[PDB]
């Protein structure tokens, strides 16, 4: 399972960056357009950026908490790749490296960051809590998965609602779904990750001892773009201007002064897209409630 | 042992065992000494040669004056270095505006406070930064100081090296303060620590106690009632040991919460426990066991022989504790409890009034007085004091010192001299603080 590209094609794109061109039609520092559409279920969404397609799912159920944090509920994200999304991939390799490179990000992007209040999953302390689940599916790759799965999970959390609960010791009263309403969830902050994609037009030494910074960085590598890149970097931020994570794990060497200059441009990008989610969550729920207005008057 | 760095800089290992949750968790740390440790004073000209900026690029302020209160030779000019115990006994004496303007805090003394009490530790943290032109408190990090650091000697407890290092801490001081003849006064309360300097063991050092320091002030009459401190019909019991209550907590033996002691019945109170529905009364003066109303305590249920109708093993008590919840569902005979330990005192500074029976008119000397408190629920406090003929028609501030075994009413000391009874200004004042209202003006660190 190996992608084969000519070195002639390798120089071609490398030339295009040397004349400030890229094959998609975007700018270097331009991001794709995002299509968000929900299914009928809560925590159901289809997210699409041109060629890359994803789908995720949020659910929850009853379990006991750990001994470790006996206060808090349970939550984890599955991101199992299927070779459906591209023939590179093993059947569910949880031990591949790029998978881990997809994993630990979303592990840190959600779980260690804590966008979601796990303490608001405590139904009863130590007895019964929530087990909230996030199964990420990939559909078709043009890269940006780890940015797409960044979004589509956080999209899904802002669309899921959990049903109604009443406690009497052991008499724990999960109510019928349609009499007593499902209840949405508590998001502390909304993180958005950004892939950065790096291209030395030169050898090693002109990056190493060539003092002249000459390295091109772009956003959202397409599939062919992604196969030649030299370093890998993802930052994540919010609306309140705090930096969630940064991960440059090796690759090409890279100036620090670039990275701050990189990460500022992230901010203006992610903010506009964030609010686009925020209206569509409202507007769909508005469309839910206008169709709820088109239901009770109908019934 | 120890090792050296090429900057002349020392490195060694301080290592202990964390005793948390009864575990035996060995904890090792490296330790550094530095040689840029400032003496932080006005008169010295060489510790200002070594001061270097912080990450906010500041060289700090060397505030202890050339001019202390100078006293009778062989005191002369002097600085004061303290005990934790004299702080633990006399924390409010430190807060006198009238005196004690120049005190070095040793780092170990700082730590024992941080070991002992958290909000008391706030106050020294408060006072040192809010030192002013008048009163100046520094913290000398003596065990960060190379020239004052000591080790654990062979066959030693941790208490020995505490007193020795404080003694070592003072030893460097006058040596650095020989050139200006400002002395350093070590204040203690410990009689064995007041034994080793009787022979003047190594240092020709100023080892005075509190009163042995207090008896040398020009104005010591105003402050000696802020010095902290048969009387028997029966004997009160005691509070359980550390391993007993920590051994009690996990098994479900012991319980904590809050207690309310009644005013209409001074000798009866109940708690609201997490395991228990109804307010579980504690009946009996010995069973209240010399705690005050509102405190955090640790209680034990009483046997059904002491239960009330309106063993050795804890194998019995838990099964009896189940019978309590049965008797809680009775509401016909309901259980009684007693305290066995005090989780926390809710003590603070307190304001009351004295008894005219407790005072002699003809006397001018020291005498016992009891304070009638403004809190109706809390009992009187025996106060051994001189100026009671003054303060009888006056409002007062005390602070509770201790409860030893014998005393039916506790030992405390008068703190702040307020003003005349039903004068409008003084009755304005205690109406603030006993209602917990901050009133003091904005300090020097505020106006910056």
């Amino acid at each position: 399972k190996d992608i084969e590209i000519s070195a002639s094609e390798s120089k071609f794109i490398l030339e295009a960056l040397r004349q400030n061109y890229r094959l998609d039609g975007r700018s270097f520092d331009q991001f794709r357009d995002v299509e968000i559409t929900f299914g009928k279920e809560f925590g159901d969404v289809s997210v699409k950026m041109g060629n890359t397609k994803v789908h995720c799912r949020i659910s929850c159920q009853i379990a006991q908490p750990y001994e470790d944090r006996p206060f808090e509920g349970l939550f984890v994200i599955s991101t199992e790749i299927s070779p459906m999304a591209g023939s590179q991939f093993e059947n569910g390799n949880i031990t591949g490296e790029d998978e881990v490179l997809c994993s630990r990000i979303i592990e840190k992007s959600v779980r260690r960051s804590g966008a979601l209040d796990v303490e608001g999953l405590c139904i009863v302390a130590g007895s019964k809590c929530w087990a909230v689940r996030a199964d990420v599916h990939f559909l078709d790759c043009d890269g940006g998965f780890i940015d797409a799965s960044c979004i589509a999970v956080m999209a899904g959390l802002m669309h899921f609602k959990k049903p109604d609960i009443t406690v009497h010791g052991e008499q724990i009263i999960v109510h019928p779904v349609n009499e007593r309403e499902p209840v949405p969830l508590g998001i502390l902050h909304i993180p958005i990750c950004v892939t950065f994609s790096f291209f030395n037009p030169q050898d090693t030494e002109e990056n190493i001892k060539g003092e002249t910074n000459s390295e091109i960085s772009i956003i959202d590598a397409t599939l062919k773009e992604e196969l030649l890149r030299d370093g890998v970097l993802t930052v994540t931020l919010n609306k309140n201007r705090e930096v969630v994570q940064v991960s440059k794990a090796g690759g090409l060497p890279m100036d620090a002064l670039t990275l701050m200059k990189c990460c500022h441009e992230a901010y203006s990008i992610i903010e506009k897209i964030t609010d686009q989610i925020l209206q569509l969550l409202k507007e769909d729920s508005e469309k839910r409630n206008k169709y709820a207005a088109m239901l009770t008057s109908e019934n | 042992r120890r090792k050296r760095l090429a900057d002349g800089l020392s490195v060694t290992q301080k290592v202990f065992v964390r005793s948390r949750n009864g575990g035996a968790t060995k904890i090792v740390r490296e330790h550094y000494l530095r040689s840029d440790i400032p003496c932080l004073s006005r008169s010295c000209t060489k510790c200002p040669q070594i001061v270097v900026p912080d990450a906010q690029n500041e060289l700090p302020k060397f505030i202890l004056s050339d001019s202390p209160l100078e006293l009778s030779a062989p005191i002369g000019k002097h600085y004061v270095v303290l005990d934790t115990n004299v702080v633990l006994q006399a924390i409010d004496l430190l807060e006198n505006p009238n005196c004690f303007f120049d005190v070095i805090v040793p780092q170990i003394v700082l730590d024992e406070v941080r070991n002992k009490s958290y909000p008391v530790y706030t106050r020294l943290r408060t006072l040192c930064r809010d030192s002013d032109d008048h009163k100046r408190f520094i913290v000398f990090h003596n065990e960060f100081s190379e020239h004052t650091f000591v080790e654990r000697l062979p066959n030693e407890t941790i208490n020995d090296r505490n007193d020795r290092a404080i003694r070592k801490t003072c030893q460097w001081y006058s040596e650095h303060l020989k050139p200006y003849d400002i002395n350093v006064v070590l204040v203690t309360n410990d009689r064995l620590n007041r034994e080793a300097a009787t022979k003047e063991v190594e240092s020709n050092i100023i080892t005075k106690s509190l009163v042995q320091y207090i008896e040398l002030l020009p104005n010591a009459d105003d402050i000696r009632d802020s010095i902290p401190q048969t009387f028997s019909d029966f004997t009160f019991p005691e509070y359980y040991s550390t391993a007993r209550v920590m051994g009690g907590l996990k098994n479900g033996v012991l319980y904590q919460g809050n207690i309310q002691i009644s005013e209409y019945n001074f000798l009866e109170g109940s708690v609201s426990l997490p395991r228990f529905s109804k307010p579980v009364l504690i009946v009996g003066q010995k069973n209240l066991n010399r705690a005050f109303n509102g405190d955090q305590v640790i209680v034990e249920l009483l046997p059904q022989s002491e239960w009330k109708a309106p063993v050795i093993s804890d194998k019995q008590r838990r099964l009896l504790a189940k019978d309590a919840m049965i008797a809680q569902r009775s509401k016909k005979i309901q259980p009684t409890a007693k305290v066995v330990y005090i989780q926390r005192r809710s003590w603070r500074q307190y304001v009351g009034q004295l008894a005219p029976s407790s005072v002699d008119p003809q006397s001018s000397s020291t005498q016992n007085v009891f304070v009638i408190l403004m809190d109706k629920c809390l009992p009187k406090v025996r106060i051994r004091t001189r100026r009671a003929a003054e303060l009888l028609d006056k409002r007062i501030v005390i602070s509770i010192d201790s409860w030893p075994t014998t005393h039916k009413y506790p030992l405390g000391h008068f703190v702040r001299d307020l003003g005349t009874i039903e004068s409008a200004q003084a009755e304005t004042e205690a109406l603030l603080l006993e209602h917990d209202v901050e009133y003091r003006p904005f300090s020097k660190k505020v106006l910056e």
Binding site: - | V17, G22, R152, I158
Partner: protein
């Protein structure tokens, strides 16, 4: 290793000499020179570091833990790691399961010395990291552990020890440690060639052998666990029992001299 056949005769020739000859020509009962370091992981209850002549290399760590000695049977646990190998491999697990048997709690282990209270005691962890080996590594590994137990200090009990009635939670001083008094065992690798029995088989000597032994030494004597043990599997031959009876005192009349060399402080 992979060696050549023409050697393998000569090696099986020279060692099966009746005036028996080692490839390094030691006396038949000798061992090889080693180095023994301890007390260097100051986060641990004890540490150990041992150096072979062929550069085989291990370190065994000692961490302790306080436990109820009634709810748990095994008061002493061994856990082993070999570099370069999977958990699943054979030589890992057998050596691992071996030293547990070697340090059963009352076989050569004096668990009364481990006893804290009438209710509590000390769970210990024999934690082993082998950097490299070229040998059947086992008898090396006991040696550092012997020094590791001789380099282990434990914090001092303060309170009393009878928690049946009063059920006190036990208390330790924060500086005062006491050495674990213990009589740890020792393990020796043997090998049988023809009519000769070498001591400390080096890897070449370990390769050519017909069969070999492992003999548990403890308390100044022979004891269990004792296993006949294959080294290779291309040259596995059977054996007269008096040769098995020979090696025991052949170990034993040279054992404590090795012990006293290490019983040396």
């Amino acid at each position: 290793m992979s060696l050549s056949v023409a050697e393998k005769s000569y090696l099986y020739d020279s060692l099966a000499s009746t005036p028996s000859i080692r490839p390094d020509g030691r006396l038949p009962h000798q061992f090889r020179p080693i180095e023994i370091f301890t007390d260097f992981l100051p986060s641990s209850n004890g540490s150990s570091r041992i150096i072979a002549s062929d550069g085989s290399e291990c370190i065994v760590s000692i961490k302790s833990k306080v436990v109820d000695h009634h709810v748990e049977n095994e008061l002493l646990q061994v856990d082993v790691d070999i570099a370069g190998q999977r958990d699943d491999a054979l030589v890992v697990e057998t050596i691992t399961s071996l030293l547990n048997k070697v340090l059963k709690s009352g076989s050569g282990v004096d668990s009364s010395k481990l006893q804290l209270t009438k209710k509590y005691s000390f769970k210990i962890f024999v934690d082993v990291l082998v950097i490299s080996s070229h040998s059947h590594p086992v008898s090396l590994i006991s040696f550092a552990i012997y020094s590791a137990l001789n380099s282990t200090y434990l914090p001092k009990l303060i309170s009393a020890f009878d928690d049946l009635e009063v059920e006190e939670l036990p208390t330790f001083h924060d500086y005062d440690m006491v050495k674990l008094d213990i009589n740890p065992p020792l393990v020796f690798i043997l090998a049988v060639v023809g009519n000769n029995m070498l001591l400390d088989p080096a890897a070449n000597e370990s390769e050519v052998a017909n069969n070999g032994l492992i003999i548990s030494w403890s308390n100044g004597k022979i004891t269990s666990p004792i296993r006949s043990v294959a080294l290779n599997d291309s040259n596995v031959k059977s054996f007269k029992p008096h040769l098995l009876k020979q090696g025991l005192a052949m170990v034993e009349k040279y054992a404590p001299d090795v012990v006293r060399s290490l019983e040396n402080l």
